[PDB]
Amino acid sequence: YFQGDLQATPGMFITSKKGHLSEMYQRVKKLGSGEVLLCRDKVTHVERAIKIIRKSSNSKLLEEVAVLKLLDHPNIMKLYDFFEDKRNYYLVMECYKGGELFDEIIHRMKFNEVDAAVIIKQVLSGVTYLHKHNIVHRDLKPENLLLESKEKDALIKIVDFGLSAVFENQKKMKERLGTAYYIAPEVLRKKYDEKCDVWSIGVILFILLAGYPPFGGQTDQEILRKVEKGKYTFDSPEWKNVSEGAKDLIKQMLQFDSQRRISAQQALEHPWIKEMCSKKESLPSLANAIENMRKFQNSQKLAQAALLYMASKLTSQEETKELTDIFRHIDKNGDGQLDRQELIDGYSKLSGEEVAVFPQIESEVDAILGAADFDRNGYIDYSEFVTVAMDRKSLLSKDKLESAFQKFDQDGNGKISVDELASVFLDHLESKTWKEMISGIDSNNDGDVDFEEFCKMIQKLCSNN
Ligand SMILES: Nc1ncnc2c1ncn2[C@@H]1O[C@H](COP(=O)(O)OP(=O)(O)NP(=O)(O)O)[C@@H](O)[C@H]1O
Ligand SMILES: [Ca+2]
Ligand SMILES: [Ca+2]
Ligand SMILES: [Ca+2]
Ligand SMILES: [Ca+2]
Ligand SMILES: [Mg+2]
Structure with a gap:
């Protein structure tokens, strides 16, 4: 290696x-x-x-x-x-x-169009990412959607992957799983794909706007027989003032034919989602982000692993709030990955400076991609972005360096050994590579990495040019 x-x-x-x-x-x-x-x-x-x-x-x-x-x-x-x-x-x-989104539904009883769109776009963003990674949730409902904090703009979090599955593009799933109100009719027929999750979101959006489910009943037997038929209506007074755009999205998600049913990705792009979320947004930029990202070029893998752990697992919601909002903005299709074209289009929010029509920006994007793409998948993933864009004062706090060192030092002897270095990422393989990765940052020639050496390596990475 x-x-x-x-x-x-x-x-x-x-x-x-x-x-x-x-x-x-x-x-x-x-x-x-x-x-x-x-x-x-x-x-x-x-x-x-x-x-x-x-x-x-x-x-x-x-x-x-x-x-x-x-x-x-x-x-x-x-x-x-x-x-x-x-x-x-x-x-x-x-x-x-x-709390759960279920709790908010019980307390609020119904959501306005802007509030419903803001929530549903987040569920769709999460689901777009899952489906792109061949994961189907199979139990999307308000009980399985948690709010980040009790704060006003707190993010929605998809939870409970107990009924989840890895799906294949060539094979249909057969296991009848889910919840009575939310289950897709093709799940009830034991022959379905990932579109079953889009149906579940459609049921959730119907509930947000109306305050009641599209397929009801006193018993599960009653609900399931209504689901099997796939017949529902907007002919109720709760729907009188609801826009044509909101009803159009619900109709596409509750499309009985799975093949004609809107995808989570396409639903995120729906004109009603765009209109309502533009009303909510009607916005900060990053300072010296490109210079900070360039520091990762050719950087030590132990230093990348440390900073990635500190940024992805050790940071609070308060520390990443602005970064997550910038990430969400650049991530136009909301798939949780920043591709080359997204980085190009949303470059003004990264550099801080405004972009003119007249090449240089494309070269800088390829430099950022070369440095920040730690797993070489062609995209800047969520945790990769948080790592390379976070301010030093917040990311390099003593407690974060301590916890990152403690994680890699499995036996807790105060030193990262050759066996532990191969275990941070390759456990079975013995190579001079691990010994040489350590020798490059070893200041006391003991063949191990102590806390001081670990900190100095990270300090050399995020240091000024
Ligand atoms: N990451 C989390 N943070 C905070 N609360 C959580 C988290 N994960 C699960 N919970 C809560 O743990 C409690 C029990 O969850 P769980 O046992 O998975 O489902 P449950 O008992 O069937 N209740 P429900 O999810 O509403 O159907 C619920 O109140 C969840 O909201
Ligand atoms: Ca994207
Ligand atoms: Ca990547
Ligand atoms: Ca050790
Ligand atoms: Ca040493
Ligand atoms: Mg649950």
Whole structure:
């Protein structure tokens, strides 16, 4: 291996490891009853939501963890850590305190068109990203949509991937799963694809605007027979003042024919979404972002891995708020990835300076892509953007450097060894590459990386030219 072969990804920080709950977390309170527990990190004091699942029959959970570790989008849940005991599996998740969207529906009872569009565009953005990564949720409903915070513009987070699946473009899914009000009729017929999720969102949008479901009944039997027929109506007084554009989107998402049904990507682009979200937006720019991004060119892989962990797993909502809003703006199609053309079009928000019609901008975009694209997938992913654009004063705080070092130092002896370096990303392979990656930053010739050496390497990376 060479260093140019290594890839820093958010998923590499999650691996099946042996651990005890009491060793690293303190129990605060029971959040769900399978058990959701609010816990406090014994070192950083950060509170996290831990899903305790009791103990191949355990293959379903491992496949879910394999999906969960990949999830990197402003509108999708984040998995902080994963560990196991002799009896239980521990899914350490980022805690969201704004409640479920279900709670807001019960309290508000109905949403205006602008509010409904803002929420639904976020669900569609999350779903567009899932579908592009061959993931189908299969249980989208207001109970599985959490609000980030209790703050006014708090982001929607898609949660509960328990019924999720990796789908194939050539094969239809057969498992009848979901919730009575939200289930697509083709799921009931045991022959469906990812369009089943678009149906679920259509039902959610109908509820937001009207305050009642499109397929109702006193029993599940009544609801499902209405779902099977696929017949619903806007002929109710709750719909009198609702625009033609909102009804048009619902009709396309609740299109009985899966092939003719709007995709999550196309629904995000719908004229009603565009009009309503433009009303809400009617906006800050980044300073010295291009110079900061250029620092990552040819940078040490251990330094990339450290900063990626600090930015993606160690930063608060308050620290990333402005970055997430800029990312969402540049990400025109809301797929959670910034492609070459998106970077070109939204360049004025990155550089700060205004772009004229007259080449240089395309060269700078390819330089940014070469530096920030840590996994070499051709895009600047969400966590990659947060890493390369974050201000130094916030990203390089002592507590973040301490936690990043502690994560990589598996045995906790105060030194990152050759075995641990290969484990941060390649565990089985023995190579002079790991030894040489360390020797380049080793100041006391002991063949290990101590906290001081770790900090100096990161400081050299984010230092002025
Ligand atoms: N990351 C999280 N942050 C905060 N709360 C969470 C998080 N994940 C799950 N919860 C809450 O944990 C509680 C139980 O979730 P869970 O057991 O997965 O579903 P449930 O018991 O069927 N309730 P529901 O999701 O409304 O159908 C719910 O109140 C969730 O909102
Ligand atoms: Ca995009
Ligand atoms: Ca990338
Ligand atoms: Ca060690
Ligand atoms: Ca050393
Ligand atoms: Mg649930």
